[PDB]
Each structure stands twice: as C-alpha cells, then as structure tokens.
Amino acid sequence: YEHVRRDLDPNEVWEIVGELGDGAFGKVYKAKNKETGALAAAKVIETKSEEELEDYIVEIEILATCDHPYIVKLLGAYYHDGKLWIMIEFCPGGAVDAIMLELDRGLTEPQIQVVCRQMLEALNFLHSKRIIHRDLKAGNVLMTLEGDIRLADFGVSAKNLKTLQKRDSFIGTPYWMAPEVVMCETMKDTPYDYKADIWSLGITLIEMAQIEPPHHELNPMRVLLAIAASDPPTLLTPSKWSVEFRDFLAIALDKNPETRPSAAQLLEHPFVSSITSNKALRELVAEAKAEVMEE
Amino acid sequence: VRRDLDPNEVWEIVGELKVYKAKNKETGALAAAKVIETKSEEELEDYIVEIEILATCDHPYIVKLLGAYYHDGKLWIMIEFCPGGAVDAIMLELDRGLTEPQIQVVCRQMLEALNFLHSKRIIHRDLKAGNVLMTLEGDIRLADFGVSAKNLKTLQKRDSFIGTPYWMAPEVVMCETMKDTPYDYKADIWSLGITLIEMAQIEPPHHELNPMRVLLAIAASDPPTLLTPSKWSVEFRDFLAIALDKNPETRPSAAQLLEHPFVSSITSNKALRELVAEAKAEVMEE
Ligand SMILES: O=C(Nc1ccc(Oc2ccc3[nH]c(NC(=O)c4ccco4)nc3c2)cc1)Nc1cc(C(F)(F)F)ccc1F
Numbered sequence: 001y002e003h004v005r006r007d008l009d010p011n012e013v014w015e016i017v018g019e020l021g022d023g024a025f026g027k028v029y030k031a032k033n034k035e036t037g038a039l040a041a042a043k044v045i046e047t048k049s050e051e052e053l054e055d056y057i058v059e060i061e062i063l064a065t066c067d068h069p070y071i072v073k074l075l076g077a078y079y080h081d082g083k084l085w086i087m088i089e090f091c092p093g094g095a096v097d098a099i100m101l102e103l104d105r106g107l108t109e110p111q112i113q114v115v116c117r118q119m120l121e122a123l124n125f126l127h128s129k130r131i132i133h134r135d136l137k138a139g140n141v142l143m144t145l146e147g148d149i150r151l152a153d154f155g156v157s158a159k160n161l162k163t164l165q166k167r168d169s170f171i172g173t174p175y176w177m178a179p180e181v182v183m184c185e186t187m188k189d190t191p192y193d194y195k196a197d198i199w200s201l202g203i204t205l206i207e208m209a210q211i212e213p214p215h216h217e218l219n220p221m222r223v224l225l226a227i228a229a230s231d232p233p234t235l236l237t238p239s240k241w242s243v244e245f246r247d248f249l250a251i252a253l254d255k256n257p258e259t260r261p262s263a264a265q266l267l268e269h270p271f272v273s274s275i276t277s278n279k280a281l282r283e284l285v286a287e288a289k290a291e292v293m294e295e
Numbered sequence: 296v297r298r299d300l301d302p303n304e305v306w307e308i309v310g311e312l313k314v315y316k317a318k319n320k321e322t323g324a325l326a327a328a329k330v331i332e333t334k335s336e337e338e339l340e341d342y343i344v345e346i347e348i349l350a351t352c353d354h355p356y357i358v359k360l361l362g363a364y365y366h367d368g369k370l371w372i373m374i375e376f377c378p379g380g381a382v383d384a385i386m387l388e389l390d391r392g393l394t395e396p397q398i399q400v401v402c403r404q405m406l407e408a409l410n411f412l413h414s415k416r417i418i419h420r421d422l423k424a425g426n427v428l429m430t431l432e433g434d435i436r437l438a439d440f441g442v443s444a445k446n447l448k449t450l451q452k453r454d455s456f457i458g459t460p461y462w463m464a465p466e467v468v469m470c471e472t473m474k475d476t477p478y479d480y481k482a483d484i485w486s487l488g489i490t491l492i493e494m495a496q497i498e499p500p501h502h503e504l505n506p507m508r509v510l511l512a513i514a515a516s517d518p519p520t521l522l523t524p525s526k527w528s529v530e531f532r533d534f535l536a537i538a539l540d541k542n543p544e545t546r547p548s549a550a551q552l553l554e555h556p557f558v559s560s561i562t563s564n565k566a567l568r569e570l571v572a573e574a575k576a577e578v579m580e581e
C-alpha cells in the first residue's frame with residue numbers, strides 16, 4: 001500500500017458525475033475535480049479485506065511504473081470507507097472503437113499510422129520493463145484532444161494482473177516433460193512473452209481499417225479454431241491501402257512468434273518510421289468531438 | 296495448520312530423509328516431517344497450499360497427510376512414513392529395472408491416483424520414479440517432492456487465459472485457451488509413459504543428454520520406445536505408444552487408459568510386495 005493513501009477522503013477532491021463506457025468489466029466513473037473542474041476516471045472497487053486489496057493494488061503498481069507518454073496516466077489512489085479508488089486522467093477524445101461507431105467509419109491510413117507508431121512506442125516501453133499487455137484492441141486505445149493515444153488495459157482480471165508483470169517458468173523435470181509443456185512453457189519468462197502483443201497490434205490495425213477484427217462473424221469460441229487453422233489475415237481491399245501498410249501487416253501477423261519482429265524493430269518499418277506528427281489523428285478526434293457537440 | 300501446539304511435544308526427530316524422519320512420542324508411529332522455515336505470515340500462506348492439496352488427496356495411492364503445525368516460524372507438514380522408499384532407489388539398489396508384472400502394478404496404481412487427482416482438478420506435473428513411494432504391502436504412495444511455493448497454486452488450479460479471442464496470437468490460442476480445462480491433465484499422461492520406460496530401463500529416454508539439451512530433443516524427436524522391444528509384451532508397447540502421443544488432444548486420459556489390457560486385469564499387488572522385500576534385503580548387504 002505504498003501508492004495508496006488511507007488518510008485522504010477522495011470525496012473531498014472528486015465528484016462523481018457519471019459512468020464511463022458500458023461497464024462490461026466493472027464500474028468506471030466519470031469524476032469532476034470539485035475545485036478545478038478537471039476530469040478523471042475513477043475505478044472504484046469494494047474489497048473490505050487487506051488480502052483482496054493486495055491483488056487489486058497490483059494494477060496501481062503497474063500504472064505507477066508505466067509513466068510513458070502513450071500509457072494512461074495514474075493520478076493517484078485512495079483506500080477509504082472500504083473502497084479502493086484508482087484515479088486516471090480523463091482522455092477527452094474517447095476510445096478508438098467508440099470513435100468509429102460515432103463516425104460510422106474506420107480510420108484512414110494516416111490516422112492508423114499515428115496509432116500504430118504510438119502503440120509501438122508504448123509496447124517498446126512496456127516490453128523493456130518486462131510488462132506485457134495481452135489484450136490490445138481498439139477499445140483499449142484512448143485518445144486526447146491533441147491526437148495522442150493513451151493505452152489502457154480495461155479488461156484483464158485482477159487475478160491475472162501479476163502475470164502481466166512476470167511469467168512463471170516451466171514446471172517439471174526435463175526428461176519427463178510432455179511436448180506441449182516444453183512448447184508452451186520453456187520460453188516463458190523470456191522476451192518470447194512479448195511477441196503476442198505484436199500480433200494483436202496487427203489485428204488492431206485491421207480492426208481500425210475495417211471497424212471489426214478478422215473472423216468477427218464467428219462466436220468467441222469458434223474464432224479460436226479459425227485463428228489456429230487460417231493463414232494470417234490480410235486487408236480486405238488491398239488496393240485501398242499502401243504497400244507499406246500491407247507489408248507491415250504481413251510481417252507483424254507472423255504465426256511463428258520466433259520470427260515475428262519486436263516493437264523496436266517495427267519502429268524502423270517504413271509504415272511508421274517517418275511518422276513524426278499526430279495531426280491526422282488529431283483531426284479524427286476533432287471530427288468526433290464536433291459530432292458530439294450536436295448531441 | 297495448527298498454531299497452538301509445539302510439534303516437538305508430539306514428534307521426536309530420529310533422522311533425516313529438509314525432511315526429517317519423526318517418531319510419534321505417544322504411539323511410536325513413523326512419519327516424515329517436512330519443516331519449512333518461513334520468514335513471515337504471508338510466507339506461511341504460500342506453503343499452506345501444499346497442505347490444502349494433501350488434505351483433499353485422501354486416496355489410497357497418494358501420500359497420507361497426518362497433520363500440520365506452524366510454530367516458532369516453521370511450518371511442519373507430517374506425512375505417513377513409506378517404509379519401501381521410492382522406486383528409483385529400488386532400481387539403484389538392485390541394479391536393474393522392474394519386471395513387466397511389477398510395472399503393471401505401478402502403472403495400474405498410478406493411473407488410479409492420477410484419475411483421482413484429475414477428478415479434483417489437481418495436476419502433478421513432475422511424475423517420475425523418484426516420486427513413487429512404496430509401502431511394505433506393495434502399494435504406491437504418489438508424492439510430489441520438488442514443488443515450489445509459487446507452483447503449488449498452479450497444481451491446484453490454472454488461471455483462465457488472458458485476452459480477447461479475435462485479437463489473440465496463434466501461440467496464445469495454442470498454449471493458453473485450453474488452460475483451466477481437462478486439457479491440463481494430459482501432460483501427466485505423457486510423464487506417466489516416460490516413468491514406465493524409466494522403470495523398465497532404470498533411466499528415462501535421452502538420459503545421456505544434459506537437462507536443458509533434452510528439452511530440444513523432446514521437441515525434435517518422435518515419441519520414445521522401449522530399447523529391446525521383444526522383452527516386453529505387445530500390450531505394454533501398445534500402452535506406451537498410446538500414452539506417448541505428442542498431441543495432448545489425441546492422448547488418452549487416465550480413466551481411458553485404465554481400460555487398456557496392460558492394466559485392466561491387474562487384481563493383486565503381489566509383484567510389488569515381492570520387489571519391496573527384495574530391495575530391502577539388498578540394502579542389508581550394502
Ligand atoms: O489501463 C488500466 N486501467 C484503467 C482503468 C480505468 C480506465 O478508465 C478510463 C480512463 C480514462 C478514460 N477516458 C475516457 N473517455 C471517455 O470515455 C470519453 C467519451 C467521450 C470523450 O471521452 N474514458 C476513460 C476510462 C482506464 C484504464 N490498467 C492497466 C493498464 C496496463 C497498461 F499500461 F499496460 F496499459 C496494464 C495493466 C493494467 F491493469
């Protein structure tokens with residue numbers, strides 16, 4: 001409980017003014033600073049036991065160390081009246097999936113290029129700290145009005161948070177170990193663990209280009225079979241997209257994690273290597289905000 | 296775990312097996328005392344998972360928990376002493392592998408134990424002859440000696456997979472999406488097969504390689520077979536060929552293997568009772 005204040009009443013600072021998202025993974029509240037009017041998200045968790053508090057606090061540990069321009073910003077944490085409050089800077093551009101719904105369209109390639117560049121910067125940062133994300137998707141890409149992303153991890157269970165920090169090495173004695181254990185465990189606790197996010201990044205790019213991820217017509221159990229059996233996904237209409245975009249996807253959506261490149265390697269790929277302005281994404285956010293001003 | 300009693304008032308330490316040999320001061324019964332020096336209460340919580348596992352595993356062919364204590368910063372786990380020792384020591388002492396009738400009894404009993412464990416969602420994950428303790432009556436007591444505090448939790452329950460299916464990488468689909476299902480139980484069936492070869496030949500396959508190198512050999516090689524196949528029945532070789540399936544999804548369960556003729560007509564442990572007596576008699580010569 002090093003980064004959790006037990007002596008400050010969060011209600012002295014924050015007024016709950018609504019709820020954010022659709023609450024599928026738990027209640028996240030919109031909070032307004034009673035002095036300044038500044039906005040925050042308040043993830044509030046009822047625990048009542050110091051033991052369970054320890055598990056939820058892992059999220060605070062991760063967020064506190066993940067100080068990078070493109071990761072959601074922890075403002076503070078409180079434990080008061082049997083509730084853990086995790087305060088995160090409000091992202092006034094919303095999530096990319098919500099933007100595509102609001103505007104009834106996918107992103108343009110220049111918009112995708114900004115998201116991709118910044119997601120790679122964030123992943124290179126996380127992986128450098130041995131942190132993995134493991135749930136990349138457009139709904140975890142929040143936006144600021146300046147056109148920058150803030151990467152979130154909304155949907156991971158509290159019990160799985162520790163796995164994002166550190167993987168367990170294999171269980172067994174080698175001579176007796178089953179082939180699937182060798183295959184699936186002996187590379188854990190090495191940078192092999194970071195490669196999954198690179199694939200998910202590729203899928204997220206298709207999701208942003210096409211609104212929905214590949215195989216979206218299937219139910220969530222059936223798609224697992226489709227991923228195992230199918231060649232890597234490609235963009236539906238190649239001619240709409242640059243050869244650089246298609247090549248980036250071909251390299252990231254490598255079914256073999258050993259040959260799939262790292263985030264640092266992909267920062268040199270021509271799809272993103274010259275992306276030094278967020279202006280295309282700033283304009284996407286401006287358009288979404290202008291449409292909300294209608295409502 | 297009992298906290299109000301000094302275990303030394305109940306048990307005398309009479310030797311070492313850190314696992315001690317202990318003698319009940321009231322009854323003279325012999326036990327193993329696994330004593331773990333813990334630094335804090337949180338540390339005492341991790342180790343207690345082993346007690347949770349052993350307390351639910353009351354099956355005839357699994358080591359028998361007698362009790363547990365926490366006192367003076369040490370957790371005591373008391374397990375019924377197994378006077379036949381472990382199977383690996385038997386083979387070392389006799390300088391020979393087990394006969395096929397002996398392997399049949401071990402295999403039958405290990406399958407019963409594994410079927411029981413898997414029915415409680417417990418996995419073993421370190422099956423080997425050194426984890427097969429023996430009684431004088433010729434019965435096994437399956438142990439799991441080498442587990443770490445961190446890994447105890449995994450033997451008890453696997454975490455659900457992390458991620459949303461449509462976005463998941465193929466290696467995550469392959470290695471994670473079947474966790475927390477009976478897929479988890481299949482690894483033990485392969486290890487059982489290797490243990491049977493170990494008992495037939497003293498050493499497991501690839502024993503000449505170092506432990507990190509063998510991981511590569513397991514991935515690269517066809518399933519192992521018995522070195523001198525004519526010495527072993529069609530049924531034994533077939534049982535192994537079925538159990539040592541590199542694909543866990545086509546590998547059978549313990550319940551399914553209990554129907555195999557290599558073990559399905561085993562009704563007496565006499566072969567193992569004789570083996571234990573022979574091993575003890577050889578130890579007397581050493
Ligand atoms: O990421 C989190 N937690 C977390 C918890 C709550 C949360 O709620 C938020 C925060 C800001 C928001 N801004 C908005 N805006 C709008 O709705 C909106 C509509 C119209 C305009 O604007 N909605 C928000 C919801 C966001 C994140 N955890 C986490 C992260 C990582 C990391 F580092 F690898 F990414 C690893 C492990 C982790 F556990």
Ligand SMILES: O=C(Nc1ccc(Oc2ccc3[nH]c(NC(=O)c4ccco4)nc3c2)cc1)Nc1cc(C(F)(F)F)ccc1F
Pocket residue numbers: 312314326327329345348349352357358374375376377378379380381412417418419428437438439440442447450
């Ligand atoms: O299995 C344990 N723990 C454990 C801890 C200590 C232990 O010490 C023992 C116990 C009895 C002995 N008898 C002998 N006899 C001789 O040396 C001997 C020499 C000459 C003659 O005789 N040595 C023993 C050592 C045995 C087991 N854990 C565990 C089990 C499972 C399970 F269920 F799936 F298998 C899952 C998770 C687990 F954590």
